[PDB]
Each structure stands twice: as structure tokens, then as C-alpha cells.
Ligand binder design. Structure first.
Ligand SMILES: [Zn+2]
Ligand SMILES: [Zn+2]
Ligand SMILES: [Zn+2]
Length: 178
């Protein structure tokens, strides 16, 4: 196994996957690393199994159809994995915890949102459809763009949204377009 956490790239108290060489901090993995279960398989491994069991699941899909899917176990897993892929980028730090808004010439968003809130919402099974999860994720970046206006810090939102969007298209096998 790797000697650093796959998500945050630090050493520490790591749980090792049994079916691949990745390792994880307990709360870096999503869902949090399970208490027992020998062997244990990480989320990367679980996602690869879904694909292998149903190769046709990689054919192209329309975003509108994906969003309306109910959050059954496989879609829950896919959203957890997409969330984890965002945390994998170090620029996620900016969006992880609860924000506050006091900048001359700007007013804070009407509906603040942040990664750890989305993480809790998934853990608590608060989303009934994929659309719920995707809306909250895109709201994080949209709030940031609106608040920071012409400050160059707005770019951090564009950057982490791009990671989200690329991973959304990959994990849910969105049909490629020009
Ligand atoms: Zn970690
Ligand atoms: Zn694994
Ligand atoms: Zn099949």
C-alpha cells in the first residue's frame, strides 16, 4: 500500500485498501472507513466493480436523465466518490468549512453551502435524487463567483468547479460533446 492518504497526501493513521494500493485517513475516505470488514475495499475499488459488473454503464448518458435518478445505493456511491474527487484537490480547502461574508461592496449569498455540509447531507441520506447533490455542489462555486466579483480570488471557484464538472462527466458517463 501507499504510505500517504490518497485524498490529502499526508501520512498519519492510514487504513489500507485490500484490493488496491491506496490508503486513507479515516475521515478522508467517503464514506468514513468502515469499523471492521476484512477484507476492506475502498471507494475507488467499489466504483470499478460497478463498471465491471455492467460494462454498458459506460455508454454515454444525458445529464438531464442522470440528475433525475433516485439515490439508490449505486447512485449514492457515485455521489460519494465525486465528492471525494473534489476533496482530492488541495484547493478544496477554501470550500470545505462554513464560510462567512464581510467584504466592502458585496453581500453574502442567500443560501451558503460548503463541502462538509454536502458530506453530512450524503451521510444522513438527505438527497433523494442525484439532482439534489449536484445542485448543492454547483451552488458552492456559484456563491463564490458572485461574492468575490472582480477579485482575482474568484478564480479558485472556477478551478474547483472544473474539477467537479470533469469528474461528474467521468463518473456518470455523460455523453461526450463539442
Ligand atoms: Zn487524508
Ligand atoms: Zn481500493
Ligand atoms: Zn449487465
Amino acid at each position: 500500500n501507499s504510505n500517504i492518504c490518497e485524498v490529502c497526501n499526508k501520512w498519519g493513521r492510514l487504513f489500507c485498501c485490500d484490493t488496491c494500493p491506496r490508503s486513507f485517513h479515516e475521515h478522508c475516505h467517503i464514506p468514513s472507513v468502515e469499523a471492521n470488514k476484512n477484507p476492506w475495499s475502498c471507494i475507488f475499488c467499489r466504483i470499478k466493480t460497478i463498471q465491471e459488473r455492467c460494462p454498458e454503464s459506460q455508454s454515454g448518458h444525458q445529464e438531464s436523465e442522470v440528475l433525475m435518478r433516485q439515490m439508490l445505493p449505486e447512485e449514492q456511491l457515485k455521489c460519494e466518490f465525486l465528492l471525494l474527487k473534489v476533496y482530492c484537490d488541495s484547493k478544496s480547502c477554501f470550500f470545505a468549512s462554513e464560510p462567512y461574508y464581510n467584504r466592502e461592496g458585496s453581500q453574502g449569498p442567500q443560501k451558503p453551502m460548503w463541502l462538509n455540509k454536502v458530506k453530512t447531507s450524503l451521510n444522513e441520506q438527505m438527497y433523494t435524487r442525484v439532482e439534489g447533490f449536484v445542485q448543492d455542489m454547483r451552488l458552492i462555486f456559484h456563491n463564490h463567483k458572485e461574492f468575490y466579483r472582480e477579485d482575482k480570488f474568484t478564480r479558485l471557484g472556477i478551478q474547483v468547479q472544473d474539477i467537479f464538472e470533469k469528474n461528474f462527466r467521468n463518473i456518470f458517463a455523460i455523453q461526450e460533446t463539442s
